[PDB]
Design a protein around this ligand. Sequence first.
Ligand code: HEM
Ligand SMILES: *[C@@H]1O[C@H](CO)[C@@H](O)[C@H](O)[C@H]1NC(C)=O
Ligand SMILES: *[C@@H]1O[C@H](CO)[C@@H](O)[C@H](O)[C@H]1NC(C)=O
Ligand SMILES: C=Cc1ccccc1
Ligand SMILES: [Mg+2]
Length: 227
Amino acid sequence: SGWQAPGPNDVRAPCPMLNTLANHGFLPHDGKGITVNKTIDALGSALNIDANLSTLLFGFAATTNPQPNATFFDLDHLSRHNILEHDASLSRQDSYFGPADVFNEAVFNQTKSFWTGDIIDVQMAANARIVRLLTSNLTNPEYSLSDLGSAFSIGESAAYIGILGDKKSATVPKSWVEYLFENERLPYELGFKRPNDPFTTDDLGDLSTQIINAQHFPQSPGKVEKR
Ligand code: HEM
Ligand SMILES: *[C@@H]1O[C@H](CO)[C@@H](O)[C@H](O)[C@H]1NC(C)=O
Ligand SMILES: *[C@@H]1O[C@H](CO)[C@@H](O)[C@H](O)[C@H]1NC(C)=O
Ligand SMILES: C=Cc1ccccc1
Ligand SMILES: [Mg+2]
């Protein structure tokens, strides 16, 4: 009632949030034929993401459809290596090792170990992202991260803090984030409520700046701050 696991013909993405909105039916349950109007309405209805930001994200998602100048995408188009999907994900392995779309327990265990507290703050988020970049560079001989991939990696850590939690304190309960990644269901039962205030492109930019500012390398090894 309100949630159903993907069945045999349903397609899913490397994005835990889109997978979640498909499992709840905010997006089409089968993960196919997502248009700009469906995107605005799903992200609006479930999370209170503003239309300007939903439109921007749809822009990128549409570039993953193999058909050129496309006006829709499917969730599985998003899995195409090095368009939006990138190495050093928090809950997925690098394509080099295996399929980069499904939840990977080994990788997620690394990420969790840097959330050292019941409340995840900007510092813990920044720290987990950084260890995934460094781990992927030293274990994956085909490791790469484009300027777009770097921007998306920083944006993705800002998102789970800002959209799932309180964007003002820039904090989110650890148990809410763990539940979303592990179940691809919204943690309503743990206290998650759709926020009253819309989440905008400038909220995303600001939190991305806080992530960058909380990185303290004596010397940056590779692409750790590109936007
Ligand atoms: C149309 C909207 C969206 C698109 C097209 C999209 C696309 C993507 C893609 C392609 C990835 C994979 C990047 C990688 O290799 O790690 C991803 C990851 C992610 N997305 Fe989304 N996403 C969208 C909306 C959101 C929203 C609203 C959130 C809010 C919480 C979100 C949270 C995340 C997170 C946390 C990850 C990281 C997963 C991981 O690192 O393992 N996304 N998204
Ligand atoms: C991740 O941690 C769980 C729970 O602590 C542990 O039992 C499991 O073996 C770990 N998974 C991997 C593949 O490391
Ligand atoms: C991998 O690490 C080295 C630092 O030894 C750096 O030169 C390179 O840019 C890194 N690759 C990426 C994509 O960050
Ligand atoms: C890839 C997911 C994402 C989600 C929100 C903002 C930037 C990126
Ligand atoms: Mg990835």
